[PDB]
Design a protein around this ligand. Structure first.
Ligand SMILES: Nc1nc2c(ncn2[C@@H]2O[C@H](COP(=O)(O)O)[C@@H](O)[C@H]2O)c(=O)[nH]1
Ligand SMILES: Nc1nc2c(ncn2[C@@H]2O[C@H](COP(=O)(O)O)[C@@H](O)[C@H]2O)c(=O)[nH]1
Ligand SMILES: [Mg+2]
Ligand SMILES: [Mg+2]
Ligand SMILES: [Mg+2]
Ligand SMILES: [Mg+2]
Lengths: 181, 178
């Protein structure tokens, strides 16, 4: 007899990624970023990696990632969208989730008009099945099936971003909030 | 005789508050906020505590504090820089002259919130150009330029996990780089 314990949060049916396994994946991604940008000569002030964070849900991912990137010797400067002369500089766009990729595609092609030295993308949650156009992020922290999630910046009607984990809400959450007139 | 160990950062003379030291104070502030908003019936979706974060340096302090508030049963929704009838908590990374924070508070009281308070990570009392007091303060700092935990020196060093004081050679070297 399989014993399935109840979800840790009384508002969710399942926890997909905890804060701990998110950070460890990010410490792995940071090492790759530190290796790839090794030949770019990144220094604070003189030549930092321009982190372009896509508001709003990316603020949690951006806060943890730049501190983790700093542990691996990757100096950064942050910019928020939805800016700054990125001409000649290295740009790394950060999104909390990558679903249809229509937003990330428009932002990347926009920043390339200013001609940066290079430009890649790092997403915390990749939702590959929900894509409308072909798009691959250079760096992906974790992958999720085609199910709506919240937490770690991701929201449901601007709420539950504070959930430290990426979880799946109960259906009763949507109807209890739908019944509110 | 007295010996002073080297700072753990090659770019800083001093480390004022560490990441763990800030988090401990933030959990202490979170317990007070949960007590002050105890009878407000805060709840996700229906009536969350509207967090107004003052870009840019506050994004680190906003990401950490918002999660800590969740641990203490304080549901929040984030805004970055309507609240009519909602409780508002303005978050700012550092409170120095208070000119920016006073204008934001007075701009938000136009929409008539249920209540509005302020929470700053770093309070710099001796820097005020006008009298102003934040309801919640994580830590205090003397009148000295600091960086880290979102605070920047020319858009850099925000990623430093602790609130440190840069060496004068950092200002001098970057200053002679024109
Ligand atoms: N919280 C959350 N947001 C998502 C998820 N998948 C896509 N999104 C975001 O939700 C928005 C899509 O709008 P919608 O399809 O709800 O009208 C986009 O901003 C997209 O990035 C998810 O699984 N969880
Ligand atoms: N990094 C850092 N920023 C500060 C400090 N004190 C004030 N600031 C910020 O610096 C700006 C004012 O600097 P100023 O315009 O005088 O160069 C304001 O945004 C203010 O909040 C500090 O000690 N460290
Ligand atoms: Mg959205
Ligand atoms: Mg959303
Ligand atoms: Mg500054
Ligand atoms: Mg400033």
């Amino acid at each position: 007899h399989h014993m399935e314990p109840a979800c840790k949060y009384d508002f969710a049916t399942s926890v997909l990624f905890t804060e701990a396994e998110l950070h460890t994946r990010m410490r792995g991604v940071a090492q790759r970023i530190a290796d790839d940008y090794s030949n770019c000569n990144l220094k604070p002030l003189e030549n930092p990696l321009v982190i372009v964070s896509v508001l709003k849900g990316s603020f949690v991912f951006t806060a943890d990632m730049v501190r983790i990137l700093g542990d691996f010797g990757v100096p950064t400067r942050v910019e928020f969208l939805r800016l700054c002369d990125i001409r000649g500089k290295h740009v790394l766009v950060l999104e909390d989730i990558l679903d249809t990729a229509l937003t990330l595609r428009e932002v990347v092609d926009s920043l390339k008009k200013s001609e940066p030295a290079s430009i890649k993308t790092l997403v915390a949650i990749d939702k590959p099945g929900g894509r409308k156009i072909p798009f691959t992020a250079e760096y992906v922290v974790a992958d999720v099936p085609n199910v709506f999630v919240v937490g770690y910046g991701l929201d449901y009607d601007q709420s539950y971003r504070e959930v430290r984990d990426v979880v799946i809400l109960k259906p009763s959450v949507y109807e209890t909030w739908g019944k509110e007139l």
